């Protein structure tokens, strides 16, 4: 699969931006749960279109998604929130800023910071779909896992191939690559912190989300 072949497949596999039911802490968080629960369905049928994913076991596919799902929702959130400085576009009709965070506030700022980092870097869509797929394949990789490593390496080739096209020098490609991949540490952090917050909410949710939680 060519690099350009890689980007197209990923670009074409993108899920749709879903809408909220907008217009308290319970109400808002209730809305985000509703949204996340519907996004999860698209995410699942999106992962299937991610190169290599279908070649994995059904159990492995379950593991990868159980680990990465919130990471994937969050990098989706941060991406569509790029051109909206100081706000988080959870949905086209659900655009929120820091001062309605309400134990969320810490998680909000982290998401806000990630989106600022993306905008600073002028993150391209092609690069975004690359990162998101890396997350699905990487976040739970730790038999033939290493087919996953072969695919991960392919995606890395795609990232670099993209960057060379934008006129980035050899040194500029290596640095940008690290910068993108380093952001995935933070997304890992937000996800983990997010899970914890949700674990506090369970003992006050969607039936599928609950299944996704106890996996952690």
């Amino acid at each position: 699969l060519t690099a350009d072949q890689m980007v197209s497949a990923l670009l074409d596999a993108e899920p749709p931006i879903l809408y909220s039911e907008y217009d308290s802490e319970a109400s808002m968080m209730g809305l985000l749960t509703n949204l996340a629960d519907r996004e999860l369905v698209h995410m699942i049928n999106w992962a299937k279109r991610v190169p290599g994913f279908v070649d994995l076991t059904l159990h492995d596919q379950v593991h990868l998604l159980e680990c990465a799902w919130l990471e994937i929702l969050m990098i989706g959130l941060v991406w569509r929130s790029m051109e909206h400085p100081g706000k988080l576009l959870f949905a086209p009709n659900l655009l929120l800023d820091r001062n309605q965070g309400k134990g969320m506030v810490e998680i909000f700022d982290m998401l806000l910071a990630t989106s600022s980092r993306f905008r600073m870097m002028n993150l391209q869509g092609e690069e975004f779909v690359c990162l998101k797929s890396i997350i699905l394949l990487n976040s739970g990789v730790y038999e033939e896992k290493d087919h996953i490593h072969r695919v991960l390496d392919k995606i890395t080739d795609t990232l670099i191939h993209l960057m060379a096209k934008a006129g980035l020098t050899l040194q500029q490609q290596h640095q940008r690559l690290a910068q993108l991949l380093l952001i995935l540490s933070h997304i890992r952090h937000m996800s983990n912190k997010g899970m914890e917050h949700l674990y506090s909410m369970k003992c006050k949710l969607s039936d599928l989300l609950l299944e996704m939680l106890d996996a952690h």
Binding site: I44, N45, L65, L208, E211
Partner: peptide, 7 residues
């Protein structure tokens, strides 16, 4: 649920 949806 996740298994059935993958299927």
């Amino acid at each position: 649920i996740l298994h059935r949806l993958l299927q």
